[PDB]
Amino acid sequence: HWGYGKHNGPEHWHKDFPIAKGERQSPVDIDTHTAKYDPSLKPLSVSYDQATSLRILNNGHAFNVEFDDSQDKAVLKGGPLDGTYRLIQIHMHVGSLDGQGSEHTVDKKKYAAELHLVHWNTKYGDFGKAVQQPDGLAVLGIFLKVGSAKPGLQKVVDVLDSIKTKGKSADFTNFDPRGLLPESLDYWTYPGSLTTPPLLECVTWIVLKEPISVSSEQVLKFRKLNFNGEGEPEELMVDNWRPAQPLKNRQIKASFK
């Protein structure tokens, strides 16, 4: 399998998934002095009104919240997107200390953590089918910076002990993902990939300019999950982020001045 350690980490990924060395790999560093402001990028349309969360899982690589995507109940539209994209999974990437944790970086600065609200293009029928298309996913990347407690993350924080080890999951209905959003919907966008195996180059990345805040106590608690299964030596799930990949001839655009 794979992970973030020295023996199964980001450097080994290409052996099982040769696309790891692709031309459109994620995450990437967002260079503020080169990213291009595009006046024709429409505003993001987040419609999470009837969102239906299902469960939270510790998959052994990160924890994730899975949603019911049987219909258009929690969708992303607008921005650089054509059509409708359904929310299926929310993943969190976190560091071992405040100075690192995010996968995307801004002028080389790593945020304490990064959330990935993974949505898939409805013209493809489903997620599995969508990851095979260059425009099958729209992933909203949201940075976390230490500050005031975020009500939305607190919902996840309260459940962390139920999913301490790999394979453990818990009911996670009535979770409103709007609570994970910053004030501003301004963003950066570029074509990229999944940041975890299979690393399929299928995503239109939408990385929000404004990080959401997380208290010290909340991040402390997010670093208490384990990569390992119950009964195996404790390996804290920290620094589960893939580093920035080669931008190639790709253009990162900004929806803001």
Side-chain angles (χ1 to χ4, degrees), residues 128-193:
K129 180 180 180 179
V131 304
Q132 300 161 227
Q133 293 305 140
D135 60 331
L137 304 198
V139 181
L140 206 62
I142 302 173
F143 301 120
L144 278 58
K145 175 194 193 162
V146 173
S148 57
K150 191 66 165 167
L153 298 168
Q154 194 63 27
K155 260 67 178 48
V156 174
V157 165
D158 290 332
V159 88
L160 298 177
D161 259 302
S162 281
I163 58 176
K164 187 169 184 170
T165 50
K166 180 193 176 184
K168 295 216 162 180
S169 59
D171 182 290
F172 209 57
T173 49
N174 310 295
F175 177 63
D176 188 347
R178 291 172 281 203
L180 298 170
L181 300 174
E183 303 189 340
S184 178
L185 282 191
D186 295 349
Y187 61 92
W188 285 287
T189 190
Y190 74 94
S193 70

Short mmCIF file of all heavy atoms in Angstrom, two decimals, residues 128-193:
data_model
loop_
_atom_site.label_atom_id
_atom_site.label_comp_id
_atom_site.label_asym_id
_atom_site.label_seq_id
_atom_site.Cartn_x
_atom_site.Cartn_y
_atom_site.Cartn_z
N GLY A 128 -16.28 7.22 -9.45
CA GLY A 128 -15.34 6.34 -10.12
C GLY A 128 -15.17 6.69 -11.59
O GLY A 128 -14.05 6.68 -12.09
N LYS A 129 -16.29 6.97 -12.29
CA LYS A 129 -16.28 7.36 -13.69
C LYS A 129 -15.65 8.73 -13.88
O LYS A 129 -14.86 8.98 -14.82
CB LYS A 129 -17.70 7.33 -14.26
CG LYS A 129 -17.79 7.71 -15.73
CD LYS A 129 -19.22 7.67 -16.23
CE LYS A 129 -19.31 8.04 -17.70
NZ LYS A 129 -20.71 7.98 -18.20
N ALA A 130 -15.96 9.65 -12.98
CA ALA A 130 -15.43 11.01 -13.05
C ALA A 130 -13.90 11.11 -12.92
O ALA A 130 -13.27 11.89 -13.63
CB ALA A 130 -16.15 11.89 -11.99
N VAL A 131 -13.27 10.30 -12.07
CA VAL A 131 -11.81 10.38 -11.89
C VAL A 131 -11.01 9.99 -13.12
O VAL A 131 -9.84 10.30 -13.22
CB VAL A 131 -11.31 9.61 -10.59
CG1 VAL A 131 -12.04 10.16 -9.38
CG2 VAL A 131 -11.54 8.08 -10.69
N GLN A 132 -11.71 9.46 -14.11
CA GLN A 132 -11.12 9.05 -15.37
C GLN A 132 -11.14 10.17 -16.38
O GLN A 132 -10.52 10.08 -17.45
CB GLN A 132 -11.87 7.82 -15.93
CG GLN A 132 -11.84 6.63 -14.98
CD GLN A 132 -12.94 5.60 -15.29
OE1 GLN A 132 -13.66 5.12 -14.38
NE2 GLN A 132 -13.07 5.24 -16.59
N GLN A 133 -11.82 11.27 -16.05
CA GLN A 133 -11.92 12.40 -16.95
C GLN A 133 -11.04 13.53 -16.48
O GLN A 133 -10.99 13.80 -15.29
CB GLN A 133 -13.39 12.87 -17.02
CG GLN A 133 -14.34 11.86 -17.68
CD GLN A 133 -13.90 11.39 -19.09
OE1 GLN A 133 -14.05 10.23 -19.40
NE2 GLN A 133 -13.42 12.31 -19.95
N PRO A 134 -10.47 14.33 -17.42
CA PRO A 134 -9.60 15.44 -17.03
C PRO A 134 -10.36 16.52 -16.28
O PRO A 134 -9.77 17.22 -15.48
CB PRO A 134 -9.03 15.94 -18.36
CG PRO A 134 -9.19 14.76 -19.28
CD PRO A 134 -10.55 14.24 -18.88
N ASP A 135 -11.66 16.62 -16.53
CA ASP A 135 -12.55 17.58 -15.85
C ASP A 135 -13.62 16.87 -15.01
O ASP A 135 -14.75 17.33 -14.89
CB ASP A 135 -13.21 18.51 -16.87
CG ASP A 135 -14.07 17.77 -17.90
OD1 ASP A 135 -13.79 16.59 -18.22
OD2 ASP A 135 -15.02 18.39 -18.42
N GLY A 136 -13.28 15.73 -14.42
CA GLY A 136 -14.27 15.03 -13.63
C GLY A 136 -14.47 15.52 -12.21
O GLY A 136 -15.52 15.30 -11.63
N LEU A 137 -13.47 16.18 -11.62
CA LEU A 137 -13.58 16.65 -10.25
C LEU A 137 -13.31 18.13 -10.10
O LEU A 137 -12.60 18.74 -10.91
CB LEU A 137 -12.60 15.91 -9.30
CG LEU A 137 -12.60 14.40 -9.16
CD1 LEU A 137 -11.87 14.01 -7.84
CD2 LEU A 137 -13.98 13.80 -9.19
N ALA A 138 -13.88 18.68 -9.04
CA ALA A 138 -13.68 20.07 -8.65
C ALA A 138 -13.38 19.92 -7.15
O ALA A 138 -14.25 19.45 -6.40
CB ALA A 138 -14.98 20.92 -8.86
N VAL A 139 -12.11 20.15 -6.76
CA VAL A 139 -11.72 20.04 -5.35
C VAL A 139 -11.49 21.42 -4.74
O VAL A 139 -10.75 22.27 -5.28
CB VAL A 139 -10.49 19.09 -5.05
CG1 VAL A 139 -10.22 19.07 -3.48
CG2 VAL A 139 -10.74 17.66 -5.54
N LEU A 140 -12.24 21.68 -3.67
CA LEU A 140 -12.12 22.95 -2.98
C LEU A 140 -11.10 22.72 -1.87
O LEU A 140 -11.30 21.84 -1.04
CB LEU A 140 -13.48 23.36 -2.41
CG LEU A 140 -13.88 24.81 -2.13
CD1 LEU A 140 -13.88 25.59 -3.42
CD2 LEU A 140 -15.29 24.86 -1.44
N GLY A 141 -9.97 23.42 -1.98
CA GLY A 141 -8.91 23.36 -0.98
C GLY A 141 -9.05 24.56 -0.08
O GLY A 141 -9.16 25.71 -0.54
N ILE A 142 -9.11 24.30 1.22
CA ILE A 142 -9.28 25.35 2.22
C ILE A 142 -8.16 25.22 3.25
O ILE A 142 -7.99 24.17 3.86
CB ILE A 142 -10.71 25.22 2.95
CG1 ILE A 142 -11.86 25.30 1.95
CG2 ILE A 142 -10.90 26.35 3.96
CD1 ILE A 142 -13.23 25.02 2.53
N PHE A 143 -7.34 26.25 3.38
CA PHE A 143 -6.25 26.24 4.37
C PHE A 143 -6.76 26.48 5.80
O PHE A 143 -7.85 27.04 5.97
CB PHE A 143 -5.26 27.33 4.06
CG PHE A 143 -4.64 27.23 2.71
CD1 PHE A 143 -4.79 28.26 1.79
CD2 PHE A 143 -3.82 26.13 2.39
CE1 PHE A 143 -4.12 28.22 0.58
CE2 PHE A 143 -3.16 26.09 1.18
CZ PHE A 143 -3.30 27.13 0.27
N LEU A 144 -6.02 25.99 6.79
CA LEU A 144 -6.33 26.24 8.19
C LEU A 144 -5.14 26.98 8.81
O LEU A 144 -3.98 26.59 8.60
CB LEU A 144 -6.61 24.96 8.99
CG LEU A 144 -7.99 24.28 8.97
CD1 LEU A 144 -8.46 23.88 7.59
CD2 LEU A 144 -7.89 23.00 9.86
N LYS A 145 -5.43 28.05 9.53
CA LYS A 145 -4.45 28.88 10.23
C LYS A 145 -4.91 28.98 11.69
O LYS A 145 -6.11 29.13 11.95
CB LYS A 145 -4.46 30.29 9.62
CG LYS A 145 -3.60 31.30 10.31
CD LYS A 145 -3.93 32.69 9.86
CE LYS A 145 -2.83 33.62 10.34
NZ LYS A 145 -2.88 34.86 9.58
N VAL A 146 -4.00 28.88 12.64
CA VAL A 146 -4.36 28.98 14.06
C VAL A 146 -4.95 30.38 14.36
O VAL A 146 -4.40 31.43 13.92
CB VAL A 146 -3.16 28.67 14.99
CG1 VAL A 146 -3.47 28.92 16.46
CG2 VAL A 146 -2.73 27.22 14.78
N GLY A 147 -6.09 30.36 15.06
CA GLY A 147 -6.78 31.57 15.42
C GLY A 147 -7.94 31.20 16.32
O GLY A 147 -7.80 30.43 17.27
N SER A 148 -9.11 31.76 16.07
CA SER A 148 -10.26 31.40 16.91
C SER A 148 -10.84 30.06 16.51
O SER A 148 -10.69 29.59 15.36
CB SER A 148 -11.32 32.48 16.82
OG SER A 148 -11.70 32.68 15.48
N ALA A 149 -11.46 29.39 17.48
CA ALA A 149 -12.09 28.10 17.27
C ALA A 149 -13.15 28.18 16.14
O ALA A 149 -13.97 29.12 16.06
CB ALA A 149 -12.69 27.63 18.57
N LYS A 150 -13.16 27.18 15.28
CA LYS A 150 -14.08 27.13 14.15
C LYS A 150 -15.20 26.20 14.53
O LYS A 150 -14.99 25.02 14.69
CB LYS A 150 -13.36 26.57 12.90
CG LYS A 150 -14.13 26.70 11.59
CD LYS A 150 -14.30 28.18 11.18
CE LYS A 150 -14.72 28.33 9.73
NZ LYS A 150 -15.19 29.73 9.47
N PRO A 151 -16.43 26.73 14.68
CA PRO A 151 -17.58 25.88 15.05
C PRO A 151 -17.68 24.59 14.20
O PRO A 151 -17.88 23.49 14.73
CB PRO A 151 -18.78 26.83 14.79
CG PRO A 151 -18.22 28.18 15.15
CD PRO A 151 -16.86 28.12 14.44
N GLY A 152 -17.47 24.73 12.89
CA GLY A 152 -17.55 23.61 11.97
C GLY A 152 -16.55 22.52 12.22
O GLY A 152 -16.86 21.34 12.08
N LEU A 153 -15.32 22.89 12.57
CA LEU A 153 -14.31 21.86 12.85
C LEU A 153 -14.62 21.23 14.19
O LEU A 153 -14.36 20.06 14.39
CB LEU A 153 -12.92 22.47 12.88
CG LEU A 153 -12.53 23.07 11.55
CD1 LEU A 153 -11.30 23.87 11.82
CD2 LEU A 153 -12.28 22.06 10.48
N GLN A 154 -15.17 22.01 15.12
CA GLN A 154 -15.51 21.46 16.43
C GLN A 154 -16.39 20.22 16.31
O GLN A 154 -16.24 19.27 17.06
CB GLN A 154 -16.16 22.49 17.36
CG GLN A 154 -16.21 22.03 18.83
CD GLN A 154 -14.83 21.85 19.43
OE1 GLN A 154 -13.87 22.48 19.01
NE2 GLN A 154 -14.70 20.95 20.36
N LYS A 155 -17.26 20.20 15.31
CA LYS A 155 -18.12 19.05 15.06
C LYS A 155 -17.27 17.77 14.79
O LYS A 155 -17.61 16.65 15.19
CB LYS A 155 -19.00 19.34 13.83
CG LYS A 155 -20.44 19.78 14.13
CD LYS A 155 -20.58 21.12 14.79
CE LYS A 155 -22.08 21.42 14.98
NZ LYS A 155 -22.97 20.33 15.57
N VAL A 156 -16.18 17.95 14.04
CA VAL A 156 -15.28 16.86 13.74
C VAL A 156 -14.45 16.54 14.98
O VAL A 156 -14.25 15.38 15.34
CB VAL A 156 -14.33 17.25 12.60
CG1 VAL A 156 -13.28 16.14 12.39
CG2 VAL A 156 -15.13 17.52 11.33
N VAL A 157 -13.97 17.59 15.63
CA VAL A 157 -13.14 17.42 16.83
C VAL A 157 -13.82 16.51 17.85
O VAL A 157 -13.18 15.63 18.39
CB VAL A 157 -12.80 18.80 17.50
CG1 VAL A 157 -12.26 18.58 18.93
CG2 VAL A 157 -11.80 19.57 16.62
N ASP A 158 -15.11 16.73 18.09
CA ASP A 158 -15.89 15.98 19.06
C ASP A 158 -15.98 14.49 18.79
O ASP A 158 -16.27 13.73 19.70
CB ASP A 158 -17.33 16.48 19.08
CG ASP A 158 -17.49 17.87 19.67
OD1 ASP A 158 -16.66 18.26 20.52
OD2 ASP A 158 -18.50 18.54 19.29
N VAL A 159 -15.76 14.10 17.53
CA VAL A 159 -15.87 12.70 17.10
C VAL A 159 -14.50 12.01 16.92
O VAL A 159 -14.43 10.78 16.84
CB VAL A 159 -16.74 12.68 15.78
CG1 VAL A 159 -15.88 12.88 14.50
CG2 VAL A 159 -17.60 11.45 15.69
N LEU A 160 -13.41 12.76 16.92
CA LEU A 160 -12.09 12.17 16.71
C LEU A 160 -11.74 10.92 17.50
O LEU A 160 -11.04 10.03 17.01
CB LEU A 160 -11.00 13.22 16.89
CG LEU A 160 -10.99 14.42 15.94
CD1 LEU A 160 -9.89 15.41 16.29
CD2 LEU A 160 -10.85 13.94 14.53
N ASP A 161 -12.13 10.84 18.76
CA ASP A 161 -11.79 9.66 19.55
C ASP A 161 -12.49 8.37 19.14
O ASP A 161 -12.02 7.29 19.44
CB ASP A 161 -11.90 9.92 21.05
CG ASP A 161 -10.51 10.17 21.68
OD1 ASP A 161 -9.60 9.26 21.58
OD2 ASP A 161 -10.31 11.28 22.23
N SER A 162 -13.57 8.50 18.38
CA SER A 162 -14.30 7.35 17.89
C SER A 162 -13.60 6.76 16.68
O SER A 162 -13.92 5.64 16.27
CB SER A 162 -15.72 7.76 17.45
OG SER A 162 -16.57 7.90 18.57
N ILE A 163 -12.70 7.53 16.06
CA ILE A 163 -11.98 7.08 14.88
C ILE A 163 -10.48 7.22 15.07
O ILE A 163 -9.76 7.53 14.11
CB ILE A 163 -12.39 7.89 13.58
CG1 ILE A 163 -12.12 9.41 13.77
CG2 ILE A 163 -13.81 7.59 13.18
CD1 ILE A 163 -12.38 10.22 12.55
N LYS A 164 -9.99 6.94 16.28
CA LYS A 164 -8.55 7.05 16.58
C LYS A 164 -7.64 6.26 15.62
O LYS A 164 -6.60 6.77 15.17
CB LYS A 164 -8.23 6.64 18.05
CG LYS A 164 -6.76 6.92 18.47
CD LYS A 164 -6.51 6.77 19.97
CE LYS A 164 -5.07 7.15 20.34
NZ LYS A 164 -4.76 7.27 21.82
N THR A 165 -8.04 5.02 15.30
CA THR A 165 -7.22 4.18 14.46
C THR A 165 -7.82 3.82 13.12
O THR A 165 -9.05 3.88 12.92
CB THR A 165 -6.82 2.89 15.19
OG1 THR A 165 -8.00 2.30 15.74
CG2 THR A 165 -5.82 3.20 16.30
N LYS A 166 -6.93 3.44 12.22
CA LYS A 166 -7.23 3.08 10.85
C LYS A 166 -8.36 2.07 10.77
O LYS A 166 -8.33 1.08 11.46
CB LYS A 166 -5.99 2.51 10.20
CG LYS A 166 -6.15 2.09 8.76
CD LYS A 166 -4.96 1.29 8.38
CE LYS A 166 -5.07 0.74 6.99
NZ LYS A 166 -3.88 -0.13 6.75
N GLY A 167 -9.35 2.36 9.93
CA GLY A 167 -10.47 1.45 9.76
C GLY A 167 -11.69 1.77 10.58
O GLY A 167 -12.77 1.31 10.25
N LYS A 168 -11.51 2.51 11.66
CA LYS A 168 -12.62 2.92 12.51
C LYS A 168 -13.40 4.05 11.79
O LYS A 168 -12.78 4.87 11.10
CB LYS A 168 -12.07 3.42 13.87
CG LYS A 168 -11.40 2.34 14.65
CD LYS A 168 -11.62 2.46 16.14
CE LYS A 168 -11.28 1.08 16.78
NZ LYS A 168 -11.47 1.04 18.26
N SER A 169 -14.74 4.04 11.90
CA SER A 169 -15.62 5.03 11.27
C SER A 169 -16.79 5.27 12.22
O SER A 169 -17.05 4.45 13.12
CB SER A 169 -16.18 4.53 9.95
OG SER A 169 -16.92 3.35 10.18
N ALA A 170 -17.54 6.36 12.01
CA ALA A 170 -18.63 6.63 12.90
C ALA A 170 -19.67 7.36 12.13
O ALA A 170 -19.36 7.99 11.15
CB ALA A 170 -18.11 7.45 14.01
N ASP A 171 -20.93 7.23 12.53
CA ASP A 171 -22.06 7.94 11.90
C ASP A 171 -21.70 9.39 11.97
O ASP A 171 -21.18 9.86 12.99
CB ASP A 171 -23.33 7.71 12.73
CG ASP A 171 -24.56 8.36 12.12
OD1 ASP A 171 -24.64 9.61 12.14
OD2 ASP A 171 -25.46 7.63 11.65
N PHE A 172 -21.96 10.12 10.89
CA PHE A 172 -21.64 11.53 10.89
C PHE A 172 -22.70 12.30 10.13
O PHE A 172 -22.37 13.15 9.33
CB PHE A 172 -20.22 11.78 10.32
CG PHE A 172 -19.56 13.01 10.89
CD1 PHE A 172 -19.38 13.13 12.27
CD2 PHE A 172 -19.16 14.06 10.06
CE1 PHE A 172 -18.80 14.29 12.84
CE2 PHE A 172 -18.56 15.24 10.62
CZ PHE A 172 -18.39 15.35 12.01
N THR A 173 -23.96 11.94 10.35
CA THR A 173 -25.09 12.61 9.72
C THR A 173 -25.27 13.99 10.36
O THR A 173 -24.63 14.32 11.36
CB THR A 173 -26.39 11.81 9.91
OG1 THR A 173 -26.54 11.45 11.30
CG2 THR A 173 -26.38 10.56 9.06
N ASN A 174 -26.05 14.83 9.68
CA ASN A 174 -26.36 16.20 10.10
C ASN A 174 -25.17 17.08 10.23
O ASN A 174 -25.19 17.98 11.07
CB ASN A 174 -27.18 16.20 11.37
CG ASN A 174 -28.36 15.28 11.25
OD1 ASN A 174 -29.24 15.53 10.43
ND2 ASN A 174 -28.30 14.12 11.91
N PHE A 175 -24.13 16.80 9.42
CA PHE A 175 -22.94 17.65 9.39
C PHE A 175 -23.12 18.64 8.23
O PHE A 175 -23.35 18.25 7.07
CB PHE A 175 -21.66 16.88 9.17
CG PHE A 175 -20.45 17.78 9.08
CD1 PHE A 175 -20.07 18.57 10.16
CD2 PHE A 175 -19.68 17.83 7.91
CE1 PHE A 175 -18.95 19.40 10.09
CE2 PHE A 175 -18.57 18.65 7.82
CZ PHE A 175 -18.19 19.44 8.90
N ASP A 176 -23.04 19.91 8.57
CA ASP A 176 -23.20 20.99 7.61
C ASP A 176 -21.83 21.42 7.13
O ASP A 176 -21.11 22.08 7.86
CB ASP A 176 -23.84 22.17 8.32
CG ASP A 176 -24.23 23.28 7.38
OD1 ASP A 176 -23.81 23.29 6.21
OD2 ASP A 176 -24.98 24.17 7.85
N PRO A 177 -21.44 21.07 5.89
CA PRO A 177 -20.11 21.51 5.46
C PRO A 177 -19.90 23.06 5.24
O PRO A 177 -18.77 23.49 4.98
CB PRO A 177 -19.87 20.67 4.19
CG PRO A 177 -21.26 20.56 3.60
CD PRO A 177 -22.11 20.27 4.84
N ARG A 178 -20.95 23.87 5.36
CA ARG A 178 -20.85 25.34 5.18
C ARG A 178 -20.03 25.89 6.32
O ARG A 178 -19.45 26.98 6.22
CB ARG A 178 -22.23 26.00 5.17
CG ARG A 178 -23.14 25.70 3.95
CD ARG A 178 -24.54 26.26 4.15
NE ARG A 178 -25.37 25.41 5.02
CZ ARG A 178 -26.72 25.38 5.04
NH1 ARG A 178 -27.44 26.16 4.24
NH2 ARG A 178 -27.35 24.50 5.82
N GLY A 179 -20.00 25.15 7.43
CA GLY A 179 -19.22 25.56 8.59
C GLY A 179 -17.69 25.44 8.41
O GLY A 179 -16.91 25.84 9.29
N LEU A 180 -17.27 24.88 7.29
CA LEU A 180 -15.86 24.72 6.99
C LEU A 180 -15.39 25.80 6.04
O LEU A 180 -14.23 25.76 5.60
CB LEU A 180 -15.60 23.38 6.29
CG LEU A 180 -15.92 22.11 7.06
CD1 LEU A 180 -15.84 20.89 6.14
CD2 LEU A 180 -14.97 21.98 8.21
N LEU A 181 -16.24 26.77 5.73
CA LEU A 181 -15.89 27.80 4.74
C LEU A 181 -15.45 29.12 5.33
O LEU A 181 -15.83 29.45 6.45
CB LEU A 181 -17.07 28.05 3.82
CG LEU A 181 -17.60 26.88 3.00
CD1 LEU A 181 -18.88 27.30 2.25
CD2 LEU A 181 -16.51 26.38 2.05
N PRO A 182 -14.50 29.82 4.66
CA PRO A 182 -14.01 31.13 5.12
C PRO A 182 -15.05 32.15 4.67
O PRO A 182 -16.04 31.78 4.02
CB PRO A 182 -12.70 31.30 4.36
CG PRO A 182 -12.93 30.55 3.07
CD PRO A 182 -13.67 29.29 3.55
N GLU A 183 -14.87 33.40 5.06
CA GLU A 183 -15.79 34.48 4.65
C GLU A 183 -15.78 34.69 3.16
O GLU A 183 -16.82 34.72 2.53
CB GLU A 183 -15.38 35.80 5.28
CG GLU A 183 -15.32 35.73 6.78
CD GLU A 183 -15.13 37.10 7.38
OE1 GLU A 183 -14.67 38.00 6.66
OE2 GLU A 183 -15.41 37.25 8.57
N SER A 184 -14.59 34.87 2.61
CA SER A 184 -14.42 35.12 1.19
C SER A 184 -14.38 33.85 0.34
O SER A 184 -13.82 32.82 0.77
CB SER A 184 -13.12 35.89 0.96
OG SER A 184 -12.93 36.10 -0.42
N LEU A 185 -15.03 33.91 -0.83
CA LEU A 185 -14.99 32.81 -1.76
C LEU A 185 -13.97 33.09 -2.88
O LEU A 185 -13.99 32.45 -3.92
CB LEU A 185 -16.39 32.46 -2.34
CG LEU A 185 -17.29 31.64 -1.39
CD1 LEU A 185 -18.53 31.11 -2.10
CD2 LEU A 185 -16.54 30.47 -0.76
N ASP A 186 -13.04 34.02 -2.65
CA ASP A 186 -12.05 34.28 -3.69
C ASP A 186 -11.14 33.10 -3.68
O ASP A 186 -10.83 32.57 -2.61
CB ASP A 186 -11.24 35.54 -3.47
CG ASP A 186 -12.09 36.79 -3.53
OD1 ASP A 186 -13.27 36.72 -3.94
OD2 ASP A 186 -11.55 37.83 -3.10
N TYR A 187 -10.59 32.79 -4.85
CA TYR A 187 -9.79 31.60 -5.00
C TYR A 187 -8.75 31.68 -6.10
O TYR A 187 -8.70 32.64 -6.89
CB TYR A 187 -10.77 30.44 -5.35
CG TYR A 187 -11.53 30.69 -6.69
CD1 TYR A 187 -11.03 30.20 -7.93
CD2 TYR A 187 -12.70 31.41 -6.72
CE1 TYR A 187 -11.70 30.45 -9.14
CE2 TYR A 187 -13.38 31.67 -7.92
CZ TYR A 187 -12.87 31.19 -9.13
OH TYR A 187 -13.52 31.49 -10.32
N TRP A 188 -7.99 30.60 -6.18
CA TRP A 188 -7.01 30.38 -7.21
C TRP A 188 -7.53 29.09 -7.85
O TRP A 188 -8.16 28.28 -7.16
CB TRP A 188 -5.65 30.09 -6.60
CG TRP A 188 -4.99 31.29 -6.08
CD1 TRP A 188 -4.42 32.31 -6.81
CD2 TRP A 188 -4.71 31.56 -4.70
NE1 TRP A 188 -3.80 33.20 -5.95
CE2 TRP A 188 -3.96 32.75 -4.66
CE3 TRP A 188 -5.01 30.91 -3.50
CZ2 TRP A 188 -3.50 33.29 -3.46
CZ3 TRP A 188 -4.56 31.44 -2.33
CH2 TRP A 188 -3.81 32.61 -2.31
N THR A 189 -7.26 28.91 -9.14
CA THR A 189 -7.67 27.73 -9.89
C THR A 189 -6.59 27.37 -10.91
O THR A 189 -5.90 28.26 -11.44
CB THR A 189 -9.12 27.90 -10.58
OG1 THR A 189 -9.57 26.64 -11.10
CG2 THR A 189 -9.12 28.96 -11.75
N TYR A 190 -6.44 26.07 -11.17
CA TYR A 190 -5.47 25.51 -12.14
C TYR A 190 -5.85 24.02 -12.32
O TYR A 190 -6.56 23.45 -11.50
CB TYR A 190 -4.00 25.62 -11.58
CG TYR A 190 -3.69 24.61 -10.47
CD1 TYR A 190 -3.10 23.38 -10.77
CD2 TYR A 190 -4.02 24.88 -9.14
CE1 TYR A 190 -2.86 22.44 -9.77
CE2 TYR A 190 -3.77 23.94 -8.13
CZ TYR A 190 -3.18 22.72 -8.46
OH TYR A 190 -2.84 21.82 -7.48
N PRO A 191 -5.43 23.38 -13.42
CA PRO A 191 -5.74 21.95 -13.63
C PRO A 191 -4.71 21.06 -12.88
O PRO A 191 -3.50 21.27 -12.95
CB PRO A 191 -5.62 21.80 -15.15
CG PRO A 191 -4.54 22.81 -15.51
CD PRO A 191 -4.81 23.99 -14.61
N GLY A 192 -5.19 20.08 -12.15
CA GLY A 192 -4.29 19.25 -11.40
C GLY A 192 -4.81 17.86 -11.18
O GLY A 192 -5.64 17.35 -11.93
N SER A 193 -4.35 17.26 -10.08
CA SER A 193 -4.68 15.91 -9.76
C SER A 193 -5.16 15.71 -8.32
O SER A 193 -5.30 16.67 -7.51
CB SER A 193 -3.39 15.08 -9.96
OG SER A 193 -2.37 15.36 -8.96
#
